Ligand binder design. Structure first.
Ligand SMILES: *[C@@H]1O[C@H](CO)[C@@H](O[C@@H]2O[C@H](CO)[C@@H](O[C@@H]3O[C@H](CO)[C@@H](O)[C@H](O)[C@@H]3O)[C@H](O)[C@H]2NC(C)=O)[C@H](O)[C@H]1NC(C)=O
Ligand SMILES: *[C@@H]1O[C@H](CO)[C@@H](O[C@@H]2O[C@H](CO)[C@@H](O[C@@H]3O[C@H](CO)[C@@H](O)[C@H](O)[C@@H]3O)[C@H](O)[C@H]2NC(C)=O)[C@H](O)[C@H]1NC(C)=O
Ligand SMILES: *[C@@H]1O[C@H](CO)[C@@H](O[C@@H]2O[C@H](CO)[C@@H](O)[C@H](O)[C@H]2NC(C)=O)[C@H](O)[C@H]1NC(C)=O
Ligand SMILES: *[C@@H]1O[C@H](CO)[C@@H](O[C@@H]2O[C@H](CO)[C@@H](O)[C@H](O)[C@H]2NC(C)=O)[C@H](O)[C@H]1NC(C)=O
Ligand SMILES: *[C@@H]1O[C@H](CO)[C@@H](O[C@@H]2O[C@H](CO)[C@@H](O)[C@H](O)[C@H]2NC(C)=O)[C@H](O)[C@H]1NC(C)=O
Ligand SMILES: *[C@@H]1O[C@H](CO)[C@@H](O[C@@H]2O[C@H](CO)[C@@H](O)[C@H](O)[C@H]2NC(C)=O)[C@H](O)[C@H]1NC(C)=O
Ligand SMILES: *[C@@H]1O[C@H](CO)[C@@H](O)[C@H](O)[C@H]1NC(C)=O
Ligand SMILES: *[C@@H]1O[C@H](CO)[C@@H](O)[C@H](O)[C@H]1NC(C)=O
Ligand SMILES: [Ca+2]
Ligand SMILES: [Ca+2]
Ligand SMILES: [Mg+2]
Ligand SMILES: [Mg+2]
Ligand SMILES: [Zn+2]
Ligand SMILES: [Zn+2]
Lengths: 482, 482
């Protein structure tokens, strides 16, 4: 390939010098207070995923891809974070969630409780609850918002509002008899009850709000889509029942309604768009369900109204479930979508008053290599066959996962399959039903007020302490001297 | 496990707040000029590797390891860098070397020349040479030094002094006939000939300095270790012949001589401790060959004398051949050794005048996962057996390494192997003679004067432009503007 400009050294020299110029300008720091704080979480968005998603964004624009700049690559400050859990070398989504949201690391499986709480032991929850940055923001008067493509009671969003001993306790249906008897409340219940005045809530997880065997509006025929609540409660009503009557509060379940809403009119918005998790972006129906980008836009429009500010938590989410199934095309595409929503949030907010942080809870066993040439598709094959089995191999390869396919002592001859298909599973070293997480460190991109405080290699619990300090919320309100 | 201190939230909160205080203290930036510039290059040290080497270091101290802090983890500033070559999506060791040393991105295989030079096309070299930061320093009066565990003529260090159309041209013995007739000179020749006043040069690669069929001093019996220069030159003598007589210039080949040298006496040092690349740190002979840290200590002592300053290029090196051979235990120990050398250099220099940068040329398809518990050995197994083949699997798994083991249609039952052996090769998805590189981005840790300028995600060619600007060398000397 080699573009003709990339053959000339002056091109690279000017490129670096201009980057040097801006780097020198960034010595003048943004010490302003963070009126708003927005946190993007790519579930499973390791540095390997970020690079591959960069190539994909550019390749979808008929470019080689390596030289493309993701919206998160345009953030000025980058830092790594150590994801290890108190119990787990390779962490889960729940324990990490307690770290970057509540400011404390916890055991695998727990949500919003310290390491003293034992998983599935409900009687150890009491006294060990840890509040999240969401609460600190609402307690400081700011509006709060949660947007995700996974269930609203999934592990990543649940750490914002709930304090449960097990992340699997989505509704009272999944709770064991002892847990209910000890007084534990399910995650869905805690969504409406813990913090009642949560301004914006959008995402999947509809079935966990309606009583059991109740028929779902979008899929009335689906037995899976039926409600799960043994309590016989309409939590959707319970949502508005805690809201003041004089305040306009709407519940929506499909995209047509979402686009029709006027943000100046809506003071509280609850949107459950699917019984379970929302579909992948490659499988989304254009008319019925909304994309993450549009969902983030309407949220900011609603939340911008509060003069005290707002906190918004967005989760790409589905990247995790994508890597879990070994379908790199699904996961990588989800990552590009979140990047678009990050760029849109840049047009809806100002860098002077809004602190934006893009990070991930953990990495994955996703590997992308094979000495591919410049421009070679991110889902493409290696240039040469393996010296051993004389068979070609994909550039994308997983360590462990369901992509391991060995036919009778021979690895799959990939030249005859559709490896570019959306649901193709790259080869694996160890067969597993689902691919595992990764203990590697993840990146933290930060732009805005006090983003230079997210420097270097530090722990994962450190991230929310920076945001809270910049916004003058939480425990350390020293950024604004009284 | 669950450390008892980590069960209390106040522990994490205090620790995070402490990180905040120093983060704010780093708002006072280091605008001093860089008298000295030290660059550590972990050959193949991806984000997956730094985390694993972190776990290893702490575990060698009978600790869990995840909480351990590598010397590079204590650097204040981290940044990601784009490694792609002009010809290759997944880069090689040579083209990357041209970027972070000479400031321009190049084709795979070319060293010290721009993207217009074609691999093995010797007649395209003239006019396309790009100078390195090593040259800018020696042209600026500072002493210069190269320390590596690979051959002194290998790909990574060669970009410092040489401008060759092919990295395989170690000596004239490996050069094709047309290259010689077109006037191309080998790398080893260019080491002594391109830059005559290179103060310190240490590493392997003896055979490329001595005439053909000669005898290696350490191994008189090995025919492979016998010299290879068909031109019949003693490049060691060529070294001293260019050095001034009034300046003391010593050549050493074993550890006993190196530790006996007095740095106050030595003005020029050439130390070749092996015919080829030096041994792994796990197989190094204590008396004959020195560790990288020992080489760095004495090297810094010699170069510190120059009052105008010094530049030192260090390469852990053997990390790459460790990943290539699929033996993670070899590579990881190599990485920890490089980290120790970073700590040694930290006491020998001051952060006020010395800019230290640690980066990598590329990544590897090396990943570790499996939801292992806290402390589980980095070379240990997963907690549970795979649901598919009902056999255990190692935590470390390679994408496409030689570790692929199928015994009669089934992957190897690892309960029967010594996965802790130093030469064990973790399992892979695709069998190859050597494991491939990785298109993932690498980290750049920076401490010292103007280290805050290596921020965010930028290209790989940008690293030397920061160092040159801080040291007031190269084209842009505006940092010391009158
Ligand atoms: C993996 O499967 C592929 C099938 O896609 C095998 O490669 C295929 O090889 C056949 C012959 O071996 C090729 O068909 C024809 O071969 C003759 C050679 O005499 C030639 O006249 C034709 O031009 C044509 O190539 C076929 O094209 C080729 N397919 C591809 C996609 O390359 C491959 O051998 C299998 N690998 C192993 C290790 O079994
Ligand atoms: C992978 O290798 C391991 C280790 O050789 C195999 O596990 C071994 O399986 C045998 C079955 O013949 C076990 O023997 C049985 O053990 C229990 C008590 O341990 C007892 O109920 C029986 O009387 C019988 O002796 C053996 O202990 C076990 N070894 C270890 C170390 O766990 C495993 O089967 C191999 N997997 C495959 C798929 O071949
Ligand atoms: C709406 O979604 C449908 C299907 O999900 C898309 O329709 C495709 O349109 C392209 C050309 O635009 C055709 O090649 C495909 O065959 C169509 N597929 C189907 C199943 O109808 C449509 O592009 C989407 N519209 C958007 C995203 O605005
Ligand atoms: C999405 O949801 C709205 C929910 O109201 C649906 O619109 C309703 O349609 C029924 C009859 O089907 C009418 O009686 C209601 O008045 C409508 N509601 C509103 C607010 O207009 C709508 O059908 C759905 N849109 C899609 C794409 O399914
Ligand atoms: C020199 O290297 C040797 C390894 O060759 C180290 O001594 C080894 O100690 C272990 C510990 O049980 C023994 O298994 C080996 O047999 C020993 N080998 C030899 C050759 O003594 C020794 O500690 C090293 N010394 C230093 C100063 O690093
Ligand atoms: C390393 O190098 C030194 C010098 O090359 C070696 O010391 C020599 O030892 C021999 C005996 O084998 C003597 O005849 C020479 O006079 C010594 N040279 C000097 C300059 O003193 C030494 O043998 C080597 N050490 C090792 C472990 O190989
Ligand atoms: C709660 O649970 C366990 C029994 O599962 C028991 O150790 C203990 O007595 C109870 N209380 C606390 C505070 O853990
Ligand atoms: C360089 O190399 C080849 C030698 O085979 C020849 O075609 C050509 O004349 C030369 N090209 C240039 C630009 O010197
Ligand atoms: Ca829907
Ligand atoms: Ca030796
Ligand atoms: Mg999630
Ligand atoms: Mg090398
Ligand atoms: Zn996760
Ligand atoms: Zn390399």
């Amino acid at each position: 390939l080699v573009p003709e400009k990339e053959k000339d050294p002056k091109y690279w020299r000017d490129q670096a010098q201009e980057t040097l110029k801006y780097a020198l300008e960034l010595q003048k720091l943004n010490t302003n207070v963070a009126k708003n704080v927005i946190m993007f979480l790519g579930d499973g968005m390791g540095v390997s995923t970020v690079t591959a998603a960069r190539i994909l964004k550019g390749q979808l624009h008929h470019n080689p891809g390596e030289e493309t700049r993701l919206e998160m690559d345009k953030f000025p400050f980058v830092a790594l974070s150590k994801t290890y859990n108190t119990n787990a070398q390779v962490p889960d989504s729940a324990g990490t969630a307690t770290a970057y949201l509540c400011g404390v690391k916890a055991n695998e499986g727990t949500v919003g409780v310290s390491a003293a709480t034992e998983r599935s032991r409900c009687n150890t929850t009491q006294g060990n609850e840890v509040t999240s940055i969401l609460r600190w923001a609402k307690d400081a008067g700011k509006s709060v918002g949660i947007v995700t493509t996974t269930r609203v009671n999934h592990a990543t969003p649940s750490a914002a509002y709930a304090h449960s001993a097990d992340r699997d306790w989505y509704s009272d249906n999944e709770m064991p008899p002892e847990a209910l008897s000890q007084g534990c409340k399910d995650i869905a219940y805690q969504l409406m009850h813990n913090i009642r005045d949560i301004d914006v809530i959008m995402g999947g997880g509809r079935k966990y709000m309606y009583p059991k065997n109740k028929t779902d509006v979008e899929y009335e025929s689906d037995e899976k889509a039926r409600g799960t609540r043994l309590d016989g409660l309409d939590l959707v009503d319970t949502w508005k029942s805690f809201k003041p009557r004089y305040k306009h509060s709407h519940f929506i379940w499909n995209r047509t309604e979402l686009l029709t809403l006027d943000p100046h009119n809506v003071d509280y918005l609850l949107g459950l768009f699917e019984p379970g998790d929302m579909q992948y972006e490659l499988n989304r129906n254009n008319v019925t369900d909304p994309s993450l980008s549009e969902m983030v836009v309407v949220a900011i429009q609603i939340l911008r109204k509060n003069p005290k500010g707002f906190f918004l938590l967005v989760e790409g989410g589905r990247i995790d479930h994508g890597h879990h199934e070994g379908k790199a095309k699904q996961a990588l595409h989800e990552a590009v979508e979140m990047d678009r929503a990050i760029g849109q949030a840049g047009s809806l907010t100002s860098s002077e008053d809004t602190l934006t942080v893009v990070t991930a809870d953990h990495s994955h066993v996703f590997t992308f290599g094979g000495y591919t040439p410049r421009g070679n598709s991110i889902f493409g094959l290696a240039p040469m066959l393996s010296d051993t089995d004389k068979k070609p191999f994909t550039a994308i390869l997983y360590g462990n996962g369901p992509g391991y396919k060995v036919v009778g002592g021979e690895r799959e001859n990939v030249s005859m399959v559709d490896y570019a298909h959306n649901n193709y599973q790259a080869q694996s070293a160890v067969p597993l039903r689902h691919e595992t997480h990764g203990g590697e460190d993840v990146a933290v991109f930060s732009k805005g007020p006090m983003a230079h405080l997210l420097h270097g290699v530090h722990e994962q619990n450190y991230v929310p302490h920076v945001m809270a300090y910049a916004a003058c919320i939480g425990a350390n309100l020293g950024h604004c001297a009284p």
